[PDB]
Amino acid sequence: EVQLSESGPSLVKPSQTLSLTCSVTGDSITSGYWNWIRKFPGNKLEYMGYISYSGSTYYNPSLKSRISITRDTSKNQYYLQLNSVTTEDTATYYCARLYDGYYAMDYWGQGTSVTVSSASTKGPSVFPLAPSSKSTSGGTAALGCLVKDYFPEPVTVSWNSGALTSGVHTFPAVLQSSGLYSLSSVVTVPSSSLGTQTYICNVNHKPSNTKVDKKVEP
Amino acid sequence: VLTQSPASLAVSLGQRATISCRASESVDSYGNSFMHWYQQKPGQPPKLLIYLASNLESGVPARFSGSGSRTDFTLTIDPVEADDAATYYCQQNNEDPWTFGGGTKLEIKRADAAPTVSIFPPSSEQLTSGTASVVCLLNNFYPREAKVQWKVDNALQSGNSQESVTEQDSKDSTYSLSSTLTLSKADYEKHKVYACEVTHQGLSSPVTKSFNRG
């Protein structure tokens, strides 16, 4: 199981330096090529560069002025540094392995969101969207959680700690005019079980070190 | 530069899908084509489908297929399944610079489904904050186009609602949409009727869901 895990700050002030770390477990960076890739919010992908098995590097030309990739084979990590960031550099960043036989990028990490802004962090307020006669149709009732006024992105939501996944919809975030983000996560359940079963949404906003468990009742 | 065509595309279950990747310059050298295909769904890293123009990554079903010349490549899914709803990217690493294609979003075309509409008044906890969010859920509809209209005491609302749409579900190919009407706490308790009017091809007539304050 070759596996890659990114890490680094969620929020960076403009003109400072972005420092991400890819920790590799399941094979050695002694061999193969080790890349950095970012995905802008418009959903375009852009290759950034790599460090190779021998320590050489190759960088996108639109970045040469300010990108640096290095590695530490004893920790089995490698590192991105991007100087003098602007809001244009807000993206999801991925690290990925490329190998000799295939010449393609075959193992990715999950990705880490990074925002460049002078604004400061803010944790979300989590309110229940409670089931009623106005949310119930057939044998089914809708309920959920509203996740309001957080910054920066992202937030993640589970229900009953991952033990309830069918019928779950967590919507993409919308940017309010207050400059803060907001989303909403709903699930449909059998209306009969509203009396007996407990429904808790788990809201995660790592940038502010927030976790809320909210119990949603009728 | 790599140009994909089309930018969006729709296909019924069981048909053939063909995504095109156009290259500004030959990406062949040393007998291989340095052209690869990636699938990506929201919340997930890109996933390798096809490497070296035509070779299937292991783990990938044989339903996926790749085929290409020096500057013209194509990705083919036959038969397409519900799980295939995603965005597909082509990438080139023959020569400087290594670049990705603009992306192609594949939609699964299915029968019309009517939405199930729900309405949620603001909670007691949020009303203590001084803000009231009224949310309208459209669950499990198709196609993706839809219109949500907010009424407060049978009056049209404008500029105080936002919506967001899920991407097409990987099991039943439906969508879901939330609309959120935001008023101050002072304004929220000044009116009695709050209504959500949904217009959609799957409904014979517009459907209105509403509640009274209290």
Binding site: - | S29, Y30, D96
Partner: peptide, 10 residues
């Protein structure tokens, strides 16, 4: 085949 400056050589 090794890669130098984004190009593959032998």
């Amino acid at each position: 085949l090794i890669n130098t400056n984004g190009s593959w050589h032998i």
